Design a protein around this nucleic acid. Structure first.
Lengths: 122, 38, 209, 176
RNA sequence: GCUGAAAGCAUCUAAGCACGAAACUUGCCCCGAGAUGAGUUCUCCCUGACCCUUUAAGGGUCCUGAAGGAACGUUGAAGAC
RNA sequence: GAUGUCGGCUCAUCACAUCCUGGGGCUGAAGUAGGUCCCAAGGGUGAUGCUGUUCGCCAUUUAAAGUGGUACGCGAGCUGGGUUUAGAACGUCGUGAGACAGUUCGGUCCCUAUCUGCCGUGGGCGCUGGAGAACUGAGGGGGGCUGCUCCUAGUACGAGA
RNA sequence: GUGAAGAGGGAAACAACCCAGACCGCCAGCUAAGGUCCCAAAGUCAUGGUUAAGUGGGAAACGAUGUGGGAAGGCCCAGACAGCCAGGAUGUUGGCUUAGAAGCAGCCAUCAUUUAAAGAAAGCGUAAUAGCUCACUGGUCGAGUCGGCCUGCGCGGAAGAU
């Protein structure tokens, strides 16, 4: 469950450190974004010589939440923090080239094959 | 369809017909001569 | 088509071999005993009246007892009617069992929902609560305005207000039939159904499909 | 009126049956009947039909003219009937008749099957041609219109179902 | 749109015959015979006297009280009561 | 011998001069898109930065972010930031006391509901001998929104995009 | 003039509008304004017209083959109006700027002359003649036809919030 003003960690090597959800996009009055959902964010903190700057507005995909995901089994997978991956604003493709920390099975959608391939686990 | 208070013939081929209490102009040559009075 | 009267036994899961858990409601459908057949000539419409379960002989009055004796069936805990379609016919004294639903795969379950008592507008009608702070005076869960002014001069009929909630007959439509177990008198439907455990349920084939 | 003045000639082999207002025509092609308006006098004579207004009916002449036209069409109906020819224009547009049903392939994602009425028979010389035959002028015209409505002739290439004797008057988009 | 005069032609309209929208009326769900216009089916139960008069769809008396219902009590995933 | 003002809040209801979705004619309508007009109220029609603000402008959504009426709907429902008491200062004006739809800071919002109106919940009688159930349906209400992807199909179209 | 300072009848209700001013009583009559199918008293009245929208029973400039009349016209039975087999001797690629739009670029020759009548173009796409109708008027069909005027009553224009 990610909503406006939620702070996120960054799960790739794009350069950002902290981002804040600006809009849960993909519907009117839509409230939350789970894993696999696309959100618009602003960058609150970045490393000195990254590919992105502080204050940039662009899209991202949520890959880890500490609310978690549920499997058809009824089981649930929770994480310790909320993480996302930065995407180009127009072509929703990852900015970075390395993916940090595990991701989850819900990203296998032919749109996030880069993240699945680059991820360390699951 | 032109909806007007003043419907008139616009060329030789346009004709006045009253259908169900409505004055109408139907024209066999120019489609944009269709008119109903409303 | 007709349906059957059962009772809500409880709720559990079914695990499928491909690792899916199906939340099911267990409905015990004993034999339904036809106590009266209503026809167009005598009653003006076509339907059957059924009974199920059992009742203590001391709790059945001689009006009810005589009605049951005419059908030649044992006393049940109640009577329900099912409207008959053009095709089917039944005879008084016939018993209908759960394998009626052997090939149905969608049912409509009707029951009496759990009674919430006198409920406020926030619970009953999802009204938004007002400010918890910022000067709010004694008005944290009250409904707010209820009308306009002199021009209507009255509260419009059907206004949403606090009152009795629940304890009324509710139908849930298009439930998957997961299992029919004739020898155990069990019907398993996917999802939740109205009413508390042990309450009467009316199960009918889905009307919308 | 002065259309109704001209009597309709009843040829050989066709007979007339009158019950005041309802009239019956029988010929080699078959059976036709209708009830005329209450303001028209149907009057059979020596192998002719003559039509005139009643009394106390305003606009009895207009009704008489309509009745004359309808009965004329009936007589021409029970003999040699009527025919309507439809054409299909456009790549992949095809027609085929299967007994009492016309199958049309007009570029849709689904098949189009049209059920004919009682008195109408269809026959497709080519896949771009639909020939209709029947006794009733109104019914055959209605069926032709219904077939045409599936794919009306669009004004840029004339593609669609058209009457054989129809003018389309295409046009160009802007220029070039 | 079809056939079709008035108004040889024509013309969806005048006779007549078709269509056509998240509107309408249904269909899905709930309440519901104080629906005073108070309806319906099945079943259960009561077929003793006497007296007085204004007499009338009358009132008492004695014997009788049925089907059922209530009360009281153990209570309730029912419920302010 | 008193009909509380603005804005927000909570709750609304209606009109149609319909924002979206639906139907259709004309196009200077190839398609993709439109434009314009007609019909149509069934449902739906953003949450934020600044400002007391309605508004406005932004930054991002969305199918769309309709327009009006309702004492500019709604304070015996709520708030009280603004305006509009009494304290104080500034700019200006007046000799001054004081003033100023100029500004600034701080500044007591009572109401135990009789009647109608509405939401719930019960009794009394009637229903023509009483009773236990089960019914019917004459009317009332409710719901009635839409995206994206894929196939049809790179097919029709264009000349190509 | 009326209310004020006046009742009553009528106007659905409605000080000031209409008729008509109330001394009192009557289960008497007769009338005025308004009415006479029913609510609700009295014409389901007689005789002729006129309207079809529910006009009546709410709206303008402005539109229209909606109908009831009137007074005048033109055309025409040799034949009108229409329908139809209707096309036809144009020097015509006779003046476009240029080697055909000779017509309809824009202006100018813009005329003789034909068929029986036609075209120096009136257009439409085409700046084109190309193609098309044509005002053609040659035949055929046989009684009406085509406009204006004046008036009667209807139609559209015509969207609101319980």
């Amino acid at each position: 469950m990610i909503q406006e003003q939620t702070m996120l960690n960054v799960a790739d090597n794009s350069g950002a450190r902290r981002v804040m959800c600006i809009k849960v996009l993909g519907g009117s009055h839509r409230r939350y974004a789970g894993v696999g959902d696309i959100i618009k964010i602003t960058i609150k903190e970045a490393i000195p010589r990254g590919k992105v700057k502080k204050g940039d507005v662009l899209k991202a995909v949520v890959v880890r939440t500490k609310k978690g995901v549920r499997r058809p089994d009824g089981s649930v997978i929770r994480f310790d923090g909320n993480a996302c991956v930065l995407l180009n604003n127009n072509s929703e493709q990852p900015i970075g080239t390395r993916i940090f920390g595990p991701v989850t099975r819900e990203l296998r959608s032919e749109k996030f094959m880069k993240i699945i391939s680059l991820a360390p686990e699951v | 369809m032109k909806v007007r208070a003043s419907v008139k013939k616009l060329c030789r081929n346009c004709k006045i017909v009253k259908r169900d209490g409505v004055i109408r102009v139907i024209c066999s040559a120019e489609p944009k001569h269709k008119q109903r009075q409303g | 088509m007709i349906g059957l009267v059962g009772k809500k036994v409880g709720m559990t899961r079914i695990f499928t071999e491909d690792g899916v858990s199906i939340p099911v409601t267990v409905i015990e459908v004993e034999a339904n005993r036809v106590t009266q057949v209503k026809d167009l000539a005598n009653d003006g419409y076509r339907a059957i009246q059924v009974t199920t379960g059992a009742k203590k002989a001391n709790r059945v009055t001689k009006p009810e007892a005589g009605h049951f004796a005419k059908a030649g069936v044992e006393a049940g805990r109640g009577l329900w009617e099912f409207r008959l379609a053009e095709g089917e016919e039944f005879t008084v004294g016939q018993s209908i069992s759960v394998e009626l639903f052997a090939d149905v795969k969608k049912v409509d379950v009707t029951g009496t929902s759990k009674g919430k008592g006198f409920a406020g507008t926030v619970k009953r009608w999802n009204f938004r609560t007002q400010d918890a702070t910022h000067g709010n005076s004694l008005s944290h869960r009250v409904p707010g305005s209820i009308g306009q002014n002199q021009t209507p001069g009255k509260v419009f009929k059907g206004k949403k207000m606090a009152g009795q909630m629940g304890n009324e007959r509710v139908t849930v439509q298009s439930l998957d039939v997961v299992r029919v177990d004739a020898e155990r008198n069990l019907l398993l439907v996917k999802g939740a159904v109205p009413g508390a455990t042990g309450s009467d349920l009316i199960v009918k084939p889905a009307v919308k499909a | 009126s002065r259309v109704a003045k001209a009597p309709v000639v009843v040829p050989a082999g066709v007979d007339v049956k009158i019950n005041g207002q309802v009239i019956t025509i029988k010929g080699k092609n078959g059976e036709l009947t209708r009830t005329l308006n209450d303001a028209v006098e149907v009057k059979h004579a020596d192998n002719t039909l003559t039509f005139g207004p009643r009394d106390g009916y305003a606009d009895g002449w207009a009704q008489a003219g309509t009745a004359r036209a309808l009965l004329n069409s009936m007589v021409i109906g029970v003999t040699e009937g009527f025919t309507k020819k439809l054409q299909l224009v456009g790549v992949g547009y095809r027609a085929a008749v299967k007994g009492n049903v016309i199958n049309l392939s007009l570029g849709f994602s689904h098949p189009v099957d049209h059920q004919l009425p009682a008195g109408i028979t269809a026959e497709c010389p080519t896949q771009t041609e639909i020939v209709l035959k029947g006794a009733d002028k109104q019914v055959i015209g209605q069926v032709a219109a219904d077939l045409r409505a599936y794919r009306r002739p669009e004004p840029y290439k004339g593609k669609g179902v058209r009457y054989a004797d129809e003018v389309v008057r295409t046009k160009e988009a802007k220029k070039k």
